[PDB]
Structures are given as C-alpha cells and as structure tokens.
Ligand binder design. Structure first.
Ligand SMILES: [Zn+2]
Ligand SMILES: [Zn+2]
Lengths: 88, 274, 364, 88, 107, 179, 96, 158, 165, 59
C-alpha cells in the first residue's frame, strides 16, 4: 500500500506548490517536469516516526510510535501505529 | 478431603471465553498479534481468492449517507483551500523580506487577489462542491478521519460515484420512465444497459435501470411447469431431504428460473398427495 | 483416566480418551448395557429367577417385586407448579398466534438431531462394537457473518472413538473447501479447474500442545511448522510445542480436555474450534452404523446472499471495482451478471474484477 | 452529595498535568536570547518585564541577568519603573 | 432568580447561573458529622439555632474560544442555613397533630 | 537475630573536577538521556553494574542503582572513563556514598497498631497515606519501612554496618508483635 | 520538520530539486518552500493515509534522547505487519 | 497548614475526617495535606491516636441514610473483621466501606458500591477487594441479634 | 420452569413417610398425578428438552450428599419419569464415571440393607438400558445435607467412649 | 456572589479552572441571618450604625 501513499503525497505537493509556482513565475510545465523527475527518482535500516510514548521498566522498553516510515531490508514500509517491545 | 474441596473452590474463584480463540487462535502474550501468515495462505491469496472478511456486506445506514456527503464536501474544500493558503503565506513571507515599496504594493495586490479567491471558495455553493460524480478525493483520508474505519476506501468510493452522488436520480419511476426503460431494453436487446441508462433521458445509473427492468421482467421466472423441472425438483428434494422442512433456498440455487415460492407451491400441490 | 473437572462447569483435566473408554468397558463387563439389541409367561419365571439370584431374595419375593413395581393426553387439570406455567403458556399462545404450525427453525434443528438415530446398518458387518466411545464434538462455524462474532455458530458431529482423524477432517463440511479460485474479468464462461479442496489439501488439528498435520496426500505441507518457528524464537507465551502425523493417529489415542477449545486449520487460514462437548459410550436408539457415522447432527442454517439487482436468485458472482455496482463487493446472480457486463459477444464492459461466489448459505 | 471526599480536585490535576506537560522554562544560550530579545524591541519601543518574559520564554533570573547587562530601567511615575531594551 | 449571572473573563469565559432553591428540614450535625433532624426542644436545651440547610442549583457554562461550550450543573449546592420560624410550612412541627407535638415535648 | 538484610540500592557521588557541556556528552554518549526542559542533567545507564549515573554541568556525578559499595565505585569509575573519553579532563574526587537502601523479610505478619502505640514517639503510621509503618531509628539515623507482611525496608544509611546495626536493633521489637 | 526528508521519498525530493537547480531553471527559494510544503504534506498524509497495525519485538542495545528526539538501536528485531513478518538484524529508530 | 491543622484537630477531638474529606473542603490536595500533617506532628512533638473503623461509621452510615440497626451491624462487622485479621494492611476507611456494604446488602436499605464509595471516598474497586476478604466469614462478623432481610447465605456475589 | 419445585415436593412427601416401599411412591405418584407432568401440547423439541432436564434433575437429586430416603426417592423418581415419556426415543439418564463408582456400592448396600424394592428398581433401570454413560456429567463447552458431626460423633461413638471410660 | 466572583477571578486569572463548591462561602448567609436575629441589630454588624435596632426580641 506504500506506493498509493506516495502517489497521494506527490499529488498533494503538486497542488500545493502549483500556486506558489504560478506566483514566483515558474510555469506549470516546469512543475510537471519536477513531478515526473521525482516519480522516476522514486524507482541501512531506519525507522523515522513520532513517538507517542516511550516507557521503561528497569529493562523493558515499550514504544508506542505514531505515523512512521521504515527502511527494512531496503524495502520501505509505512505504519500508522506501531507498538513495540525491547529488552535492554 | 475438606481442604482439597476448599482448594477446588478457591481455584473456582480464580478460574478464557472462546472469544480469545477466534481467527488468530494463537495470540501472543507480549503482544496481541497472532502468528505470521501461512504459505498456504500466501498461495491462496495469490491466484486470487476472497477471504471471509473481504466478503462481508453491511447495509448502508441513513446517517452514513449524510456523513459521506459532509465528508466529501469538507475534503473538497480542504483540497481547494490548501493551494490558496500556501500562496497567501508565500506572499506574506515575501512581503516580510521584500523591502521594496512598489514590489510591496504588487505583493499586497496579489495577496488581496488570493484573499478574494479564498472568499469565493468559502462562498462556493454546494453544487460546485459536489463534483462530476467521478472526481477524486482522499477517500483513504475519509475512511480514517470522517469514518472511524468501518468502511474501506474503495467501498466508499464506489458507493459515492455510483450510488450516493446527488447527480443520480433517486425519484420514483413514472409511467413514462418505466415505459422508456422497457422500450430501450427491447430496442437494444436486454443486454446493453450502460447505453440504456444513457438514453433513458435521466441520470439513473445502469444498475437502477436494470433493477427496474428485472422487477418488472416476466421472463425472469418461467411461470410454467414442465415434467423435467418436476423430475429435477424431486431428485433435489430427496437428496437434501431431512424428513420434513426441505430447504427450498438450497434447492432453488440448483434450479433455473424458479424461486422458493413456486417450488413450495409445486411440491405441495402436485408432487405429493393432499 | 478420570474425567475429573479442572473448572466447575467449563473444563476438565486432560485425560487419555482410550483409557477412559477402557475403564467404562471394564466396569461394564458382563453386567453392562453393552448389547445394542432392540427390545423384543415363560420369560416371567426366568426374570423372577434372575431377580432372586441378583438380589438374594426368594422366587415369591421376585414375583411380588415384579408385580408391585409395574409401570404406573394433551388437556390437563388439577394443576401443579410446572403444569401451571405450561397451561398458562398454552392458553396465552391460544389467545395468541392463529397458525399453531411448528416454526420452520425448530423443525430444522429437530430433524437434524433425529436425522439418522435409530437407523441400523443394512450391512450388519460394519456395525460398531460395544463400547465404541462416541465423542460428540462441535466444530465452530467460521466467522463469515458479523453476527458470528457475537454468538459463535457451530455444527455438531458425532465422531467415533476409532474414527481415525483424517476421517473427521475429510468430513467437515466447511465452505473453505470450495470457492474455485482465479479472477474471471474477461471469461464469463470458464470451466472451474479446481476447487480449493483439491488445491490446498493441507490441514491440521491442534490438540493439547501437539499438532497433528495431514501428512497424507503428498500435495500437502506442514501448516504447523510456521507456528513452531516463532514459538522457538521470541517466546510469546505457549512455551513448548510438539507435532504428530495425524494419519496413523485415531481418536481415543489423545490426551485432551472436554469443553476446552482446540484448533482445526484447513486451507491455511480458515480456523475451526474443536471443543469436545462430551464423551459417551455407544448405546442403541442411534444409528450404530459406520459409513455415515461422523454424523453432522446440527448446523446453523445460515443466511443466503441473493443477487443485488434482482432478489429472486442467489449470488453466483462477486464483483469488485465495478463500474455499475453501487456497493464495492457486489453480489450478482448469473443472469444479471451476464447483463451488466459481457455484452453481445462475452466481452468485458467497463471495468470489474469478477470472482465466483459460492454463497455459503447454500453449501455446507 | 456535596463536598464528596476526593484525593485531588479535578481543576487541580488538570493544572498540574498542564504544568508537567509544558515543563519548566529552559535557560537558552545568551546569543539566541539576545537575538530574540532585540527582535521583540522592534515591535514595541517599551516592554514590561512580566510580558517580556513570555516573549523570551526564559527564566526570570536568567532574563534579568542578560537584560541587566545591556538593558536599563527607566522610572515612570505614571505607572511604575520598567525596563528599556535600548542599550543606551 | 433576579441575581445576574456571574460572568468571568480572564480567553476562557465562565458563566454561573443559580437556577432553583431547595430547603431541607431543620438539621443538626453531631460532632462526628452525622446529620439528624433538629427538634425545636433540642435547640432550646442545647442552645442550637433552628435552621434549615439551603441548597441551590448552579449551572456552570464555559466558553473556551474554540467554538465549544461545556455546560455542567451542580445540583443542590449548599449555600448556607436559613433560620426557620416555628410551626411554619418549613418547620418540623408543621402538619403534626396535637398528639404528635406532645410526643416531641412541644406544647 | 539470624536474618541479614540484602542491599538493594546505593546512591554514591563523585566529583569530576571539570565543568562539562551536557549537549556534547548527551549527543556523543552511548546510553545517555538529556531533556533539560524536565531535568538539568545527563542520565547515563550501563548494564553490567546495572547502574544509573546522573551527570551535572558542574562536574558532579551521582551513581545510583548498584547493589554494592565496590560495585558502585566501579560503575562510577566506568562513567568517569566514559566522560574522559568524550574529550574532558575527568578526575576522581571524593567518591562518597550518600545512601544505601537495604531490604529484608522477617517471615511473619506483624501487628502495626501495637507497634505504633508502643513507640508513638518514633513510628508514623498512617494507612491512608502509605500502608507501611515508618520507624525512624535514632541511634543510627535510619528510616525503616515495616509492612504487615513482615517486609522491612531500611534506608538512609551511609555504610553497611549501619543497616546491620539498625536491623538488629529493630528485630526483637518486631518479634514482640508477630501476629 | 527535518525528520521525514531522509527516506527514499525525501531523498528523491532532494535529488530531483538538486538536478533542477543545477539546470538553472528554478531558484533555491522555490526549492526550499517546496521542501517545507513537502514536509507539511507528508506529515498530514502519513497520519491519515494509512491504517495497518504493526508490532515489533527486539533487543535494544543503544538509546539516546537529546533535544526531544529518541534514537534506538535494535538488534535481531522482528516486525509483525498486519499479515507478514519482517526480520532485520539491526535497525535505527529515530522518534520525534 | 490550615487544612492539615483541621485534619489534626478532628483526630484530637475523637471525630477524625479522612484526608479526602478534608481535601474536598480545601483547595489543597490530599498529598499536600498529608505532607503538612506529618510536619505539624513533628513540629508540635505531638501524636494522634490511630484511626479505627468505628471512627467513621456514624458519619458514613448517616450520610448514606442507613438505619441504626444497619449502622450497628456495620460497626460490628468492621470491628470483628479487624480483630479476626481478615483485612490485614487494609486502610480503615476501606474496611469500613466494605463493612457498610456488607451490612447494607443484608438489610432492606441496600446501597451500591458506588454510593458507599462516594460518601466514604473509596473507589468501588477497593470496596470490592475489602468486601471479598470479609465475605467468606460473613455469618461470624454479623451481630447475633441481626434481622437479615437478605439471608447471609444469599449475600451479593463479588 | 418450576419442574424442580414439583420434583422436590415429591421427594419431600416421600421422605416424610420414611418409606422405601415403592407402593408409597406409586400412591404419591397417583395423588400428585405425575401421569400428566409430561402431558400437554408440545411438538417434539420442548418435549425431549424438558424430559432431558427432568431426568438430569432427578439424577442429581439421586447423588450424595442427599439423604438415603431422598436418594431412594430420587431413584424411584428417575424410574417413574424415564418409564413415562411421550418421545419415541426414551431419553436416557446421563451417568458419569465418577458417580457410577458410588452408585455401585449404593446398589450393593440396597441389596444388603434388605431394600429390595429400590434394588429391583435399579436393576430394572439397568436392564432396559436407560443409561447414557458419559465422561463428564451432562455436557461441556466454553439441599438436605449430610452432617460431618454425626459422622464424627454418633450414639454408638459416645456409647463406646462411656463404656471404656 | 461577590466572593464567588472574587474567588473564581483569582483562579481564572492563573489559568486554572475553579472549584465551584470552594468558591461558595456558606458562612455569609448562615451567620448573616443568624446574627441579625440573634442581636436584633438589623442589617450588617459592620454597619450597625445605621442598623435598625429592636426588630428582634426574646419572646
Ligand atoms: Zn473452514
Ligand atoms: Zn440478478
């Protein structure tokens, strides 16, 4: 379901910066060129997210992470809520 | 023995619900998730399959229709507003550091233009807010924000584009409308339903046209009994007999052109004495 | 072993079913009801003599015991407590419903209960022997309706204590052993190549820690394996685990609890709970047969999904991403499904993913 | 039903939670405070110490120490003596 | 009722309105906190004041400028004690037969 | 007596003798934590001595959580070498214990009311605040939490001998109130 | 926000903007406002564009919390997605 | 300090109020009253007699509107339960609330756990736990001359 | 639905007579007219369901710690009920493995105690095979007490104590 | 109500909500009514200069 998210985000960025580009003068053609080049550009493990709560019990870490993106084995996953446990 | 009885009673006080043993029968204790998916489930998902959950159909409630209408309207507004909001903020940030009075006046003109466009947006009537019944919205945003998650994105999408969008005639069928429906059905043959919905002179989808045709289609049921029909009915009844109260539905679903009403009437009146 | 409770009315301690059957058979040897022969002045003398021998009394004592202990219709009177409430319910129903005819859902469960009890085998060579240890298992219907989370439907089967699992397995009428796969979006008339029963024959029973995998049919695989994979690494409850072959193993070879949920997984993800209602010894007034013996005696009579365009037929086709369907998963009978798509040469119209629907209210 | 026994008043736990969630004001580096301090002076010629603290979001003692080095107090008989953000 | 609603503004805005008045029987509270009806004779002997608790319904509505209004009613809020005239409608002796009055050591 | 108290926690302190940046240490230390908006110190935990060291800008460190005097000293020296490695002139000045919590069990439920009535001048027992009695021993200045299950939690000490003396003093007094 | 401009998507944004600016047809400003809006849009969408439950179990080795950002280093950690299971030897989690 | 002094005065006079009851009439929280209470005792070099379950029965039962017979039964149940050590380490207010619930359920005037907790200042869970400890020996705790509207055998399941 | 009441009423009426004679039971049956307890318009399902419940009730009455008089009464009750049904498959009595081990020595005592009426009733109920021998009682998914005091102190116990004293 | 406003003003100024019960001073009505009947000085004790006297007398 990842690429649907990226399509949504890309459309979002485009209809947002459309007026900015019409304002500063950047014609729509350059904008669509950016869009296309970005899409084509789309083709270590890191989780970047927002922690809703990180709890510790003397060894036991319990993470409750909000919206986040992961880079597990080169393939990038999405999650809207990630509970997790760990032992120090 | 008495102390053993007391221990039994205590463990009764200290004594799972058969709810904790549904589809993820093996739930974890450190988490709530079950075991990973099975290679058989992988193979079954591939080659296509419909799991039990994916087949659940819930009848739409009255209030859900209003909720979807309000959701579509609000998200159309947000999508229309985000560009102008960013334009206005960019103009203001440019004014903050322009330090040129003629350029500042040009920027204030552009900002007044942006504000005027925003005012036109927030005064746009409901019609232009609706759309062309085929436009796009962040339906995955709807299903998670406006709806609690009770409906999938594509479900809402199909309900909206095909059914709920107010550009679809929901009125009753007039004599003239029913006449035209069968007229066009005959002219095209009882197959070409999209073109018929188009030619009907109304915005009723092909689905509703076919519904109104079937509900008055006499060839839907055979209405006349034949001996081979009777033979098949007897064979089926004897196969799925339980004594009395033969399931007529599961019999119909093995026959063609018949419904449980006619099967009941036939089995009672001409397939057993009485 | 002993069927001794574990909880007051919800469970018992795990016991070997074979030993239980053996204890019952032993404590009923030559003095038990293990005859299985239906009931039929000279016989009176023999009965009196037997009574005298068993009760250490005289022949006259046996005769007078037989005489004194002899055996001793709708309208009622001279009320009692329960007869009072019965009469009141009946009169209330009399002022009530005009059609006394029995409900079609009571007759269903009744006939399913008495479908084939009191039907003796026509072969009389396969008829079960005495002490055959009938286990009245009930398999939980899968969650195929929302209402099935609330009140868990189930079908009861009278498994036999020598029925050799992979016989119960081969007999459980679920609909996950159906549902011809594949998507027919450009093929209105497609031969069903293989029902899911034929394709994915693997399945297993989880009973008291141990797994029993359907290693028969070498087009099968080990569905239990996956579970073991994460019970060995990152223990998440459930401790130790074991596995068996389910083919040599028959019933009464187990060590199980009653009223305690156990698992039957077939087709990979369909899950079936295998609570054992009770183990009772074989007795007459039932089939006594062997062929039909698994004996599904109760079933849920589920609802039947009808077509969405017309309501006069059942749902043969389920479509998604349709261009005419109001709802996303839309159920069409074959008639109208052929008329909202596939026009005049059997070529796709618009766009839709059409899958074959089995309508489980109809099957199994 | 009046004055029912309670361990803590609802208005008091909410205020306590808000104070805990907000946390104590941190002592930022002098350079950042000075840069923010003078930017405030731009909007208004004269600033009150109590109101100035909110803009800087710095401890009162720390703000006074930095303000004392450059800022000066001007006595106004109309209301009171306030601080001057002008170094001279 | 005639009292103007109390308006607080210092941002959130709080409104207080005193709706309805309740009066209970003349009550006395023992040192342990147990209430009990106060007989006029007990008041005379123990030098108590023959008073009835006074309660008022108060509605508290708060406007937080977020276009959200929260309204809570504090039913029967104790606001003090009113001395009670004897043999008045709100006195314990009200509606007591002469025999009942004698049982209470009242003439 | 016969029951020796098991130590459970030891708060000691040490002086590094050099001012530090908490930002630097926090960004460059392995298991450090530093949220100044909530507390002005760096919380560095280590596993083998299983200790928690709070390090302060002034150069003073407090090591807690170790269950031995020697173990506490070793954890302190570990944190000292850690800070030394991050580019600071760490030193080891006046490593001094500041608390030692001990805990033990006497294996019999106690009647509190008897004890509080017997030593009203010492015990502060209020079961609606804290369900244990708090006996403030005076000869050694050690606070003893005594519970109805017999668990005695001595605290406030400055050496192990003090906990031992205090528990031996308190033992017969509890023996007298075995429920 | 300076958090989500590090994944494959954000790296693609940065690379595309770099290629476009090196071509001398946009200004660095338009690039930085586009990046700022990208951050806002991804923050908004990454919130209500998805709903797939995950739960991970791992052995935490290193953690750090400066300027309200958590940095965990998990070893041999498994990620239970809705359906499947992912195993990774070592993952850095950054949370703020 | 005033709130803590008010709490101490009630104890000294033999009519203790619970810390929650004092907090209800004071803007100061229970924790701060309890802390000042300890300091005031140290500063004054004085002490307060330990509270007993019978120190609250009259106020709790009168506020719940229980008859004198039910109040006497609750007073006996709590006092007997403490003597029998069926609730070791329990707060006296928790024991009293459970005893009132037991006595209330054994008479015509029946009060729910929420009702008793609101007056007693004890969460219904705490009443449930204390009640569950004294329920097994219910017949022993009740006064001999108590008229059971609900028989002790049929006392409420918990 | 109140059947427990009439069953307990019959048990009490029988134990009050202090009889083991099945003739007194037959008279109590004819007087209370249990020949009707099943009689009434039921189709088949309520019928056999209520019969199952009544048999289970009589059986659980038969078991300890109930009094010997009550036990023999419940045995006669089981006999009468099972021998009086309307359903063609005469519902069987659910008998456990644990309870069978005690019903054995109970029948043995009945023979020994010259209570041949109840002994013959039980032998008959076994002969017509009215027993479904189950594992755990009834199924599985998801009082007149016997004082220990008299087991500890009897008239014979105190008599022997005083003799030896 | 004057002291209810004054009490609530202090709490609302500090940004915290106020407890309505703690805002009410029950002495105001209880003692004010009692004092006027107790002494016969009619009005306020502080303003006894203008208070009408002899209104309340011992029966
Ligand atoms: Zn299945
Ligand atoms: Zn159809």
């Amino acid at each position: 379901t990842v690429p649907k998210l990226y399509r949504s985000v890309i459309e979002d960025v485009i209809n947002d910066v459309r007026d900015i580009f019409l304002d500063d003068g950047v014609d729509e053609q350059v904008l669509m060129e950016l869009k296309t080049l970005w899409e084509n550009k789309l083709m270590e493990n890191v989780v970047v997210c927002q922690y809703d709560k990180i709890h510790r019990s003397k060894n036991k870490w319990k993470f409750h992470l909000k919206d986040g993106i992961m880079n597990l084995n080169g393939r990038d996953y999405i999650f809207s809520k990630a509970i997790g446990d760990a032992e120090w | 023995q008495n102390r053993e009885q007391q221990e039994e009673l205590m463990r009764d006080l200290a004594g799972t619900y058969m709810g904790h043993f549904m589809k993820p029968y093996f739930k974890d204790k450190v988490t709530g998730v079950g075991p990973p998916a099975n290679e058989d489930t992988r193979e079954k998902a591939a080659q296509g399959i419909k799991a039990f959950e994916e087949l659940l159909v819930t009848k739409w409630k009255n209030w859900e229709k209003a909720l979807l209408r309000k959701s579509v309207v609000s998200d159309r507004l947000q999508r229309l507003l985000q560009p102008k909001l960013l334009k206005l903020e960019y103009l203001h940030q440019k004014q903050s550091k322009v330090s040129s009075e003629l350029e500042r006046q040009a920027l204030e003109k552009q900002g007044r233009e942006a504000e005027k466009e925003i005012q036109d947006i927030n005064q746009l009537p409901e019609e232009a807010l609706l759309g062309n019944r085929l436009d796009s919205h962040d339906w995955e945003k709807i299903s998670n924000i406006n709806f609690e998650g009770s409906r999938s994105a594509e479900e809402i999408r199909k309900f909206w584009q095909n059914s709920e969008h107010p550009s679809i005639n929901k009125q009753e069928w007039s004599r003239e409308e029913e006449e035209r429906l069968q007229a066009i059905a005959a002219a095209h043959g009882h197959l070409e339903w999209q073109k018929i919905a188009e030619e009907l002179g109304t915005s009723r989808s092909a689905f509703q046209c076919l519904q109104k045709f079937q509900q008055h289609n006499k060839a839907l049921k055979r209405k006349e009994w034949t001996e081979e029909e009777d033979r098949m009915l007897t064979q089926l009844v004897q196969e799925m007999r339980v004594g009395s109260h033969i399931p007529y539905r599961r019999i119909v679903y093995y026959m063609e052109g018949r419904d449980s009403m006619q099967l009941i009437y036939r089995w009672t009146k001409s397939l057993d004495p009485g | 072993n002993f069927p001794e409770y574990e909880l007051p009315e919800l469970n018992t301690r795990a016991f070997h079913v074979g030993a239980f059957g053996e204890l019952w058979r032993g404590r009923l040897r030559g003095a038990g009801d293990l005859s299985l022969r239906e009931p039929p002045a000279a016989d009176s003398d023999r009965e009196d003599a037997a009574v005298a021998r068993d009760l250490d009394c005289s022949l006259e004592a046996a005769a007078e015991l037989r005489a004194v202990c002899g055996l001793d219709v709708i309208p009622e009177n001279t009320d009692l407590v329960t007869l009072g409430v019965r009469k009141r319910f009946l009169e209330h129903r009399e002022e009530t419903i005009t059609i006394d005819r029995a409900c079609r859902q009571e007759t269903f469960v009744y006939e399913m209960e008495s479908h084939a009890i009191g039907k003796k085998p026509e072969n009389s060579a396969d008829m079960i022997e005495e002490g055959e240890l009938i286990l009245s298992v009930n398999i939980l219907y899968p969650v195929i309706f929302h209402k099935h989370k609330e009140h868990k439907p189930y079908q009861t089967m009278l498994v036999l204590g020598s029925q050799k699992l992979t016989q119960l397995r081969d007999s459980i009428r679920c609909v996950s052993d159906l549902q011809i796969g594949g998507e027919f979006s450009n093929t209105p008339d497609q031969a069903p190549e293989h029902i899911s029963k034929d394709l994915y024959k693997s399945a297993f029973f989880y009973f008291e820690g141990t797994f029993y995998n359907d290693k028969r049919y070498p087009e099968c695989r080990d569905l239990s394996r996956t579970i073991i994979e994460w019970s060995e690494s990152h223990d998440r409850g459930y401790g130790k685990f074991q596995t068996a072959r389910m083919e040599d193993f028959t019933f009464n070879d187990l060590c199980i609890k009653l009223g305690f949920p156990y698992l039957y997984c077939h087709q990979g993800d369909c899950e079936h709970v295998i609570v054992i209602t009770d183990i009772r010894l074989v007795h007459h007034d039932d089939c006594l047969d062997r062929t039909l013996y698994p004996l599904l005696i109760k079933k849920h009579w589920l609802w039947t999904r009808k077509c969405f365009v017309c309501k006069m037929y059942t749902a043969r086709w389920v479509t998604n991403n349709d261009s005419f369907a109001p709802e996303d998963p839309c159920f069409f009978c074959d008639v109208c499904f052929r008329m909202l798509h596939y026009d005049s040469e059997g070529n796709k119209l618009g766009e839709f993913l059409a899958y074959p629907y089995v309508d489980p209210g109809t099957f199994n | 039903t009046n004055y029912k026994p309670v361990a803590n008043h609802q208005y008091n736990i909410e205020y306590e939670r808000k104070k805990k969630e907000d946390g104590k004001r941190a002592r930022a580096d002098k350079q950042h405070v000075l840069d923010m301090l003078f930017s405030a002076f731009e909007k208004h010629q004269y600033y009150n110490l109590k109101d100035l603290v909110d803009i800087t979001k710095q401890p009162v003692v720390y703000l006074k120490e930095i303000l004392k080095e450059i800022g000066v107090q001007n006595v106004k008989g109309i209301h009171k003596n306030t601080w001057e953000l002008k170094p001279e | 009722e005639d009292a103007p609603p109390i308006d607080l503004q210092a941002p959130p805005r709080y409104l207080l309105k005193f709706e309805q008045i309740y009066l209970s029987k003349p009550t006395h509270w023992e040192r342990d906190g147990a209430p009990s009806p106060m007989m006029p004779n007990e008041a005379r002997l123990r030098n108590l004041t023959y008073s009835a608790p006074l309660y008022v319904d108060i509605t508290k509505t708060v406007i937080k400028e977020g276009e959200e209004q929260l309204q809570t009613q504090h039913q029967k809020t104790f606001i003090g004690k009113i001395p009670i005239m004897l043999r008045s409608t709100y006195c314990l002796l009200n509606g007591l037969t002469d025999r009942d009055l004698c049982e209470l050591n009242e003439c | 007596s016969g029951i020796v108290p098991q130590l459970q926690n030891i708060v000691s302190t040490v002086n590094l003798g050099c001012k530090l940046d908490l930002k630097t240490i926090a960004l460059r230390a392995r298991n450090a934590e530093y949220n100044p908006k909530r507390f002005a110190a760096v919380i560095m935990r280590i596993r083998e001595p299983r200790t928690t060291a709070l390090i302060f800008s002034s150069g003073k460190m407090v090591c807690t959580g170790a269950k031995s005097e020697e173990q506490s000293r070793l954890a302190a020296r570990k944190y000292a070498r850690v800070v030394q490695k991050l580019g600071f002139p760490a030193k080891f000045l006046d490593f001094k214990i500041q608390n030692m919590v001990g805990s033990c069990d006497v294996k019999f439920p106690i009647r509190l009311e008897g004890l509080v009535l017997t030593h009203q001048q010492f015990s502060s027992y209020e079961p609606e605040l804290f369900p244990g009695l708090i006996y403030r021993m005076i000869k050694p200045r050690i606070v003893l939490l005594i519970f109805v299950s017999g668990k005695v939690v001595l605290t406030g000490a400055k050496v192990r001998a003090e906990i031992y003396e205090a528990f031996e003093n308190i033992y017969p007094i509890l023996k007298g109130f075995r429920k | 926000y300076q958090l989500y401009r590090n994944t494959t998507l954000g790296n693609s944004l940065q690379e595309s903007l770099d290629e476009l600016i090196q071509s001398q047809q946009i200004t660095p400003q338009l690039a930085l406002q586009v990046l700022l809006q990208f951050d806002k849009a991804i923050n908004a969408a990454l919130a209500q564009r998805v709903r797939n439950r995950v739960n991970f179990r791992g052995s935490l080795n290193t953690y750090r919390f400066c300027d309200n950002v958590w940095t965990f280093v998990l070893n041999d950690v498994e990620f239970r997605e809705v359906t499947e299971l992912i195993k990774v030897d070592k993952v850095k989690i950054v949370a703020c | 300090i005033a709130s803590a002094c008010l709490y101490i005065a009630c104890r000294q006079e033999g009519v203790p109020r619970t810390f929650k009851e004092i907090c209800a009439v004071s803007r100061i929280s229970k924790k701060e009253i309890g802390r000042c209470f300890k300091l005031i005792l140290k500063a004054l070099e004085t002490s307060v007699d330990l509270i007993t379950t019978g120190d609250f029965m009259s106020r709790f039962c009168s506020n719940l509107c229980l008859p004198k017979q039910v109040q006497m039964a609750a007073t006996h149940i709590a006092r007997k339960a403490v003597e029998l050590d069926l609730v070791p380490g329990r707060s006296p207010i928790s024991v009293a609330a459970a005893a009132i619930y037991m006595a209330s359920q054994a008479s015509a005037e029946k009060r729910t756990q929420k009702e008793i907790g609101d007056i007693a200042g004890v969460a219904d869970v705490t009443i449930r736990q204390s009640y569950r400890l004294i329920y097994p020996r219910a017949p022993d705790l009740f006064p001999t001359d108590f008229k059971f509207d609900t028989p002790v055998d049929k006392l409420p399941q918990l | 639905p109140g059947l427990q009441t009439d069953c307990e009423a019959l048990l009490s009426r029988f134990q009050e007579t202090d009889s083991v004679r099945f003739e007194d039971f037959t008279e109590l049956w004819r007087n209370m007219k249990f020949g009707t307890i099943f009689c009434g318009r039921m189709r088949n399902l309520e019928k056999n369901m209520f019969t199952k419940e009544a048999l289970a009730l009589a059986w659980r009455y038969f078991l300890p710690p109930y009094t010997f008089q009550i036990r023999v009464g419940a045995l006669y009750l089981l006999y009468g009920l099972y021998n009086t049904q309307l359903c063609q498959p005469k519902q069987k009595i659910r008998v456990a493995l644990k309870d069978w081990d005690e019903v054995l020595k109970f029948q043995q005592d009945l023979v020994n105690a010259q209570h041949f009426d109840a002994a013959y009733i039980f032998r008959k109920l076994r002969l017509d095979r009215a027993f479904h021998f189950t594992a755990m009682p009834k199924l599985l998914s998801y009082k007149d007490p016997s004082d220990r005091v008299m087991k500890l102190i009897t008239s014979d116990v105190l008599e022997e104590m005083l003799n030896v004293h | 109500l004057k002291e209810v406003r004054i009490y609530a003003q202090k709490f609302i100024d500090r940004g915290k909500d106020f407890n309505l019960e703690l805002a009410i001073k029950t002495r105001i009505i209880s003692d004010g009514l009692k004092y006027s009947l107790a002494t016969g000085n009619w009005g306020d004790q502080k303003k006894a200069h203008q208070a009408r006297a002899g209104v309340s007398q011992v029966l």
